[PDB]
Amino acid sequence: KVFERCELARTLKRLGMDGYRGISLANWMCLAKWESGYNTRATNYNAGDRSTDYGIFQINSRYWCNDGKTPGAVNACHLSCSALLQDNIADAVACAKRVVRDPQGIRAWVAWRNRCQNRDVRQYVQGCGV
C-alpha cells in the first residue's frame, strides 16, 4: 500500500510512535518519506553486501529481519522480512521500535541523517490532526 501523508501520521500515532525513545512523529514521517515514499512494498537490494531493505522504513535483512538469503544475518526483530511487506504496518512499527532501542536511535538510518537531521521537519505532520 502507498499511504497518504496524514493517513500514515495518524496510523503511526495510534501505534505509539509519537515520542517513542524521544523521537517525534514528524521525525518518523521524514524517515518514511525518504526511505520509501510511504510505500509498504518497497524493496532495495544492496549488491555490495547481499542484504535487502524491506518496506516502509527500509529495514535491512542483515541485522533486523530474516529473509534466509542474507549472509551473517542476526534477525534482531525475530521476524520474517515478509512481514515488512504487508499493507498493515504493525509488525514494521514493532521492528522499528526495536531498532531505535539501540544507542544510535534513529541515526541507524543514513537517510534520516541526510534528509531530516538538523532540519525543520514540521512540514510532514502539518494539517494531519496529530
UniProtKB/Swiss-Prot annotation:
One of its GO terms (cellular component) is extracellular exosome. Its main location: secreted. Keywords: Amyloid, Amyloidosis, Antimicrobial, Bacteriolytic enzyme, Disease variant, Disulfide bond, Glycosidase, Hydrolase, Secreted, Signal. SMART domains: LYZ1 (SM00263). It holds the Pfam family Lys. Disulfide bonds join C6-C128, C30-C116, C65-C81, C77-C95. One of its GO terms (molecular function) is lysozyme activity. Residues 1-130 form the C-type lysozyme domain. It is found in: Secreted. Monomer. Lysozyme C is capable of both hydrolysis and transglycosylation; it also shows a slight esterase activity. It acts rapidly on both peptide-substituted and unsubstituted peptidoglycan, and slowly on chitin oligosaccharides. This is Lysozyme C.
